[PDB]
């Protein structure tokens, strides 16, 4: 199923996933799309901070839903 990940500058992301994947893998496939390390990635929808041990099913992430990417740098 296709899902979209909207960053915060105005970029969009296209993903080839399935409900079988967990929040960990999906964060490991996204590196490929932009380049950000998964450890520096966070995903939030409606105030819930997603978790790497969850499956797309725990969140019923369905079709045409947009996710929001967050950038947490390791310094500054």
From Swiss-Prot:
PTM sites of type Phosphoserine: 65
Domain Ubiquitin-like: start-end pairs: 1-76
Consequence when changing residue 76 to A: Loss of ADP-ribosylation
Modification (Microbial infection) ADP-ribosylthreonine occurs at: 66
Consequence when changing residue 63 to R: Abolishes HLTF-mediated polyubiquitination of PCNA
Effect of residue 72 to K: No effect on ADP-ribosylation
Effect of residue 65 to A: Prevents phosphorylation in case of mitophagy. Impaired translocation of PRKN to mitochondria
PTM comment: Phosphorylated at Ser-65 by PINK1 during mitophagy. Phosphorylated ubiquitin specifically binds and activates parkin (PRKN), triggering mitophagy. Phosphorylation does not affect E1-mediated E2 charging of ubiquitin but affects discharging of E2 enzymes to form polyubiquitin chains. It also affects deubiquitination by deubiquitinase enzymes such as USP30. Mono-ADP-ribosylated at the C-terminus by PARP9, a component of the PPAR9-DTX3L complex. ADP-ribosylation requires processing by E1 and E2 enzymes and prevents ubiquitin conjugation to substrates such as histones.
Residues bearing PTM ADP-ribosylglycine: 76
Site for Interacts with activating enzyme, residues: 54, 72
Effect of residue 65 to D: Phosphomimetic mutant that binds and activates PRKN
Site label Essential for function, positions: 68
Subcellular location: Cytoplasm; Nucleus
Glycyl lysine isopeptide (Gly-Lys) (interchain with K-? in acceptor proteins) crosslink site(s): 76
Cross-linked sites for Glycyl lysine isopeptide (Lys-Gly) (interchain with G-Cter in ubiquitin): 6, 11, 27, 29, 33, 48, 63
Membrane-spanning parts: none
Effect ascribed to mutating residue 74 to G: No effect on ADP-ribosylation
Functional summary from the UniProt entry: Exists either covalently attached to another protein, or free (unanchored). When covalently bound, it is conjugated to target proteins via an isopeptide bond either as a monomer (monoubiquitin), a polymer linked via different Lys residues of the ubiquitin (polyubiquitin chains) or a linear polymer linked via the initiator Met of the ubiquitin (linear polyubiquitin chains).
Name of the protein: Ubiquitin
Name of the encoding gene: UBA52
Residues of the full protein shown: 1 to 76 of 128
